[PDB]
Amino acid sequence: TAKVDFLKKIEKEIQQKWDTERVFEVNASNLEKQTSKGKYFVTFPYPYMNGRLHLGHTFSLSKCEFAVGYQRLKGKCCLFPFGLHCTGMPIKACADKLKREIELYGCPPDFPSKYQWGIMKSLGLSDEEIVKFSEAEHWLDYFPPLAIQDLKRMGLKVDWRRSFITTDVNPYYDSFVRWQFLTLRERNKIKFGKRYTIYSPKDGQPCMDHDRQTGEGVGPQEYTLLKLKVLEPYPSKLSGLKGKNIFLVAATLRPETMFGQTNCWVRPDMKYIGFETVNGDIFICTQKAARNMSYQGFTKDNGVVPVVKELMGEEILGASLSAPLTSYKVIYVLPMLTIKEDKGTGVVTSVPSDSPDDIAALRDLKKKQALRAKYGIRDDMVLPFEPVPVIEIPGFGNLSAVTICDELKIQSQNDREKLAEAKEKIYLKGFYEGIMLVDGFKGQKVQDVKKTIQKKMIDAGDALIYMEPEKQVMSRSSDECVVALCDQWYLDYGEENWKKQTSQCLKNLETFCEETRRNFEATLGWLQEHACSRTYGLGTHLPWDEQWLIESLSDSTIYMAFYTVAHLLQGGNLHGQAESPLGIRPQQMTKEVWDYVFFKEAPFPKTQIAKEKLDQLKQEFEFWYPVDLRVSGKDLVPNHLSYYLYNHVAMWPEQSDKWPTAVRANGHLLLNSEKMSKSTGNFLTLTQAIDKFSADGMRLALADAGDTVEDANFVEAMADAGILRLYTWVEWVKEMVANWDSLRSGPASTFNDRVFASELNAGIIKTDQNYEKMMFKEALKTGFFEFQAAKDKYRELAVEGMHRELVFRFIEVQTLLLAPFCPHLCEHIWTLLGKPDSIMNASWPVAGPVNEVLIHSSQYLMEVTHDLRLRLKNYPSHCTIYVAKNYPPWQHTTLSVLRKHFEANNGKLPDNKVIASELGSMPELKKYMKKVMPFVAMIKENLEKMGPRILDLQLEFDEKAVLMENIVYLTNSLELEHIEVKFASEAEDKIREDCCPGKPLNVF
């Protein structure tokens, strides 16, 4: 119960020792003469502050909290500073979903957790102060300070002075941003243009990834829209617009097929709309493909849909229709009753010759009279149109769609599963092997012409360009974004000579697996015009079209170097509004001033702060750059971290040594094995967990969740496993510091001492190796569970009394491995072993030699003792045990050349049909040829569990003498009286023969 309160007692105290001696602070002036093993510099991506931080936030940053704790014991100075993000609509569109809930339901509010109000009362905030949040400033007055007090109680190795806030509410960071961006105009890494990006009407701006709430990586996405003439007789429901040419509008992907046009598809219970183009004509689409067109510069008044009739395609079927590109001089509009309303325009091109949905849906209106019934389609309109050979794909003939639907045997337009895989092998095959048929292109492949076919339909005014969200994208403000076409300021992320440079920063960077380098190795290939011009959201304003703000991801890319000087400029304020310790007014640092600080070969400027101050920050910068590490989620890999490199390349143009050195992708966080969603009661915040289980326990779990890229698993049930094994360790250390009088003195020479010493030293090592590969799962595995594994064997296996000055060894070396997992615990220990310094001043306990014969031996006892505790529970008092000198007959010529198939094989023997093979053929083993492979079978499975020796005809340690050494751990925890040790050529005959060395047996 009070398992855990006790930890948080010492915890918070150490926290307030750690700060009133500023352990984790370091300054570059000081820490440059004393280069012990150099600078380590890691980073967390700073997190947006629409909230305190949650567990899956810490797991992400944990990766370094351990890292720094480990290196600074290996001999490196550590800088891991934390900054907080707010340059985003996350804070904005959160605060505003709030104020609208007040505007519409009053305050205190009244609704017909899950609402914006009912999330910040779900944090315990007074009714009077929740309303203080509507203006987004009171988020920044409020949330940044709360995060830093949160990590206080994690114990996070931070030089806190290097914090900040990120928006223009801060004057220091702000000029920094500016400098970046003056340079990127100056280096042609921004340009003004009009380009297709993904856009929120309700935001009134672009919204690339980190402004969204759906589809974090969805692209400016292309379509070919065909302009079909509605024809006289106009259908009875089209009266009014006598005044214009009225167009049906329908969005294809393969324009190269539109000769195969037979009719038009609309689902008749869908709601269409027809507007005025700026052309002056009338279109007709979904309500949404309309409002897309609009923001694409279709409607005379961009963004606004000049709707003139609402209606449902039930009123529309059967109206005559000239189509571009097809011999069917008149096609009609027909019903395909499944038309999803996400994609397209609710009006779907019909190529029955060459897509199965068309030929299927069209089969029916020909198959079933009583379908032209519910929709009154005369017989001219359906029957006589039969498909058109426009592509011939070899395998399937001219009309690849009808050909393969008579052989997938599709009955309806509703056989959907089989209509889908009909489509599969045929849409893409048609797209290379395709060769056009009808003239202009006689026999030219599809891949060639698809471009120039759509070419001629535009030029002739029969079609123009539609673009749409690939998949639906809702915004941070709950808006269905749509693909617009707009003035923006865009980063040239695709200009070749920039791309090819940074891929030499991708290759030169170190990732941690090759599913990481894979991801970027993608994103690099696709990145081009990425807008940074937001006119809405918190931020910093662009300094030459000032009306523009900066999008969250693009003011966020070289900021790390701010972490290098924020402690001298912002003095460890958060808004950096207070006065600097280095007296530089926020005004007083200008594009020349930065430039000196940040480009080595930059000239002193005529600044208004003299030389002695500004030489300082070039010293700090050039000392910690470049950035050794970034541990993020796996989710900023393709967007932020891939701009991390463009920016770093393009701003230091040749300081290759300043570029990023490493970055480690890990996955998202599972609390107790489920999506951590505040929806379903499965979610935890740092201020929530740290008070649930001691941070040193919550810390401990974290290291023990995942260290792949694959999603990690925080398991409460194991979170509490720690708070136990941790306390049961402390009250063991209290036990020895209570009982020096009973730990054996003098020489540390007992067989198990020698076992345990070279065990422990073989531990330390594995834990060094696991730590450096940053596999904190394993660093913990080897460092605690396996370190207790020996202390806990050594206590039993040595009934001779554990040695004193090899206990204090263990308590020390084990404390010292745990430092980065539990700096609080371990420091509580360190003072109580009487060291008068602090445990972040510690050094890696270098390991003594390993006596690996002395391990490979002790596995022999800790093994078979767990063996004959099985033969026992059948039924004695008086016991016997049998061994062997060399291998018995049959299994010295089994084993003598079982070798045969590895010294002249280098990797393995042949599978187990040719096992009985030519040993059965032995003049010897015909007798036991039924047990030879059973004994052969299981002695392979400890050749990847014991190493490669298991086929030496000799061991490395005297099989007996090493047992006569521990016989009394045996005659004690086995509670039999005497136990003889014979060599079994004295034994009974049934074990005289088929027991060998390593395989002992016993009488009773």
Ligand SMILES: Nc1ncnc2c1ncn2[C@@H]1O[C@H](COP(=O)(O)OP(=O)(O)OP(=O)(O)O)[C@@H](O)[C@H]1O
């Ligand atoms: N379990 C998690 N889920 C999401 N992000 C996580 C998780 N654990 C750690 N993170 C990290 O938390 C950080 C929060 O800061 P930032 O504001 O830059 O990202 P984020 O916007 O919170 O991410 P997202 O919208 O994808 O959840 C991110 O860098 C991400 O690396």
Ligand SMILES: CC(C)C[C@H](N)C(=O)O
């Ligand atoms: C629904 C499809 C058969 C229409 C057109 N061939 C396209 O792929 O968009």
